[PDB]
Design a protein around this ligand. Structure first.
Ligand SMILES: Cc1cnccc1CN1C[C@@H](c2cc(F)c(F)c(F)c2)CC1=O
Length: 472
């Protein structure tokens, strides 16, 4: 009972300090810096989903190897999400984000020069492992600098960079891969892979300049470092707004108080702490919340990734009844249609609340998925896919905000990483099942996705409201 009281007091004082610091130049600079990593994650997702399964350039593997090539990377993303989310609660958000981005960059760079299918598979798997940790770390890292007044809108604006990365990867694919003349053992897919690694390098370079989260310092006994970071934030914000004469008034902050053999014992202790943090998410205080979160994350991920592999095959069926450029253009349109949903969700998140956003978006996504069964031509299918994505992204934004706000700071990245790993597993399962339903029928995939979305909405209706409360 003592620890909960002390952490509530710390949360109240931290909210007061953030109100004193204000929102301004520092927050937007960090926003762009973390948006770079989100863009890197979007680029990785596009590459894995479209060009990675040897569309035309590689063609050095069997069809079974083509299917495995993507799913193993999704499994690596799941593993990396869990690992880096767990480690971020013990080592820090900035440290683990830097390590994961470095691993992703190194192995993405390595995969460009390898001359073998096995080595390419290994490098892409480890790149996925490195990149899987971005979202859970980034969202918590940015949330730990935001006051409660407009926290939801600021968190929702962060989702634009995933779409930006998808667009960047689509344009680079469109420009590079068809130009086979750029080959010099070397081909154009290697140039594309090399170019796709630039956003991660830029993210690392920018992130080197930003400080560690002061909330992590306060939760771990490092009062002075947190005070220095908060004073830096306050000074930057006040100098930007034209009041450099103002003095940071905070004095004291509530604080929650061979070599390889030592490496081994340290690793064992760290793994034990991570496992304890994971198991504490199923305790009596959080078990019901965690179970409801698992259902909403799983059903939404299962439906989206199931439809997005079913959709291109259905277009191919329509084209039979009626080029890589069409693939690039369709992927670009599908990722571009997300923008209005992101804008509207960012503008309405704090006005109407996370719960109403999630419920309405889930209902609209289910309705649009059911409407997908009425497709009769390529153009109508493209429009319906754009509509579905635009109406569905808002549920993902609201779920990000809820996951950020539903867990305490000492387990936030662990819970987020577990949920993101569950999402990657759901993506794997949905891709496998909807590929197993390639031509057997048409009603069944649509019905399955609609039922999953309805179950997700039903579970989302039962979540608690976190709006208007200090960040626990
Ligand atoms: C931002 C984010 C937050 N949490 C977990 C994962 C992510 C990244 N996303 C976005 C999701 C998405 C939803 C849509 F409806 C679309 F139309 C679309 F193109 C993409 C799927 C994914 O991988």
């Amino acid at each position: 009972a003592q620890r909960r009281k002390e952490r509530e007091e710390l949360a109240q004082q931290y909210e007061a300090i953030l109100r004193e610091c204000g929102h301004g130049r520092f927050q937007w600079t960090l926003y762009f810096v973390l948006g770079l990593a989100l863009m890197a994650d979007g680029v990785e997702v596009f590459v894995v989903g479209f060009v990675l399964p040897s569309a035309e350039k590689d063609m050095c593997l069997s069809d079974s190897n083509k299917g495995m090539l993507g799913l193993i990377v999704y499994l690596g993303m799941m593993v990396g999400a869990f690992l880096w989310g767990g480690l971020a609660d013990r080592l820090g958000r900035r440290q683990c984000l830097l390590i994961s981005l470095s691993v992703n960059s190194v192995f993405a760079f390595f995969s460009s020069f390898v001359q073998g299918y096995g080595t390419f598979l290994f490098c892409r798997l480890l790149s996925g492992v490195g990149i899987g940790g971005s979202i859970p770390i980034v969202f918590s890292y940015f949330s730990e600098f935001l006051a409660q007044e407009k926290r939801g809108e600021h968190l929702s604006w962060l989702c634009m960079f995933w779409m930006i990365g998808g667009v960047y990867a689509a344009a680079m694919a469109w420009a590079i891969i068809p130009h086979y003349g750029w080959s010099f053992q070397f081909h154009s897919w290697r140039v594309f892979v090399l170019v796709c690694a630039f956003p991660s390098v830029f993210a690392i370079g920018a992130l080197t300049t930003q400080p560690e989260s002061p909330r992590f310092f306060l939760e771990n006994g490092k009062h002075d470092e947190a005070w220095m970071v908060l004073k830096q934030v306050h000074d930057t914000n006040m100098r930007a707004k034209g009041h450099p004469e103002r003095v940071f008034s905070v004095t004291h902050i509530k604080t929650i108080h061979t070599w390889y053999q030592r490496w081994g014992v340290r690793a064992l202790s760290l793994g034990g702490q991570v496992w304890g943090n994971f198991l504490s998410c199923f305790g009596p205080e959080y078990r019901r919340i965690t179970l409801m979160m698992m259902g909403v994350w799983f059903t939404m991920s299962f439906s989206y990734y199931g439809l997005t592999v079913w959709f291109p095959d259905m277009i191919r069926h329509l084209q039979a009844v009626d080029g890589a450029y069409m693939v690039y253009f369709v992927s670009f349109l599908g990722t571009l249609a997300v923008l209005p949903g992101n804008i509207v969700s960012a503008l309405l998140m704090d006005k109407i609340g996370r719960l109403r956003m999630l419920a309405g978006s889930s209902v609209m996504s289910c309705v649009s998925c059911f409407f997908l069964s009425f497709g009769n031509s390529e153009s109508a299918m493209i429009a319906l896919l754009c509509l579905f994505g635009g109406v569905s992204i808002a549920s993902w934004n609201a779920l990000d905000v809820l996951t950020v706000e539903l867990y305490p700071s000492d387990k936030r990245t662990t819970a987020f990483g577990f949920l993101n790993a569950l999402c990657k597993l759901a993506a794997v399962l949905g891709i496998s099942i909807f590929t197993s339903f390639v031509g057997i029928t048409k009603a069944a995939p649509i019905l399955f996705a609609s039922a999953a979305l309805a179950l997700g909405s039903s579970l989302a209706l039962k979540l608690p409201e976190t709006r208007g409360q200090v960040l626990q």
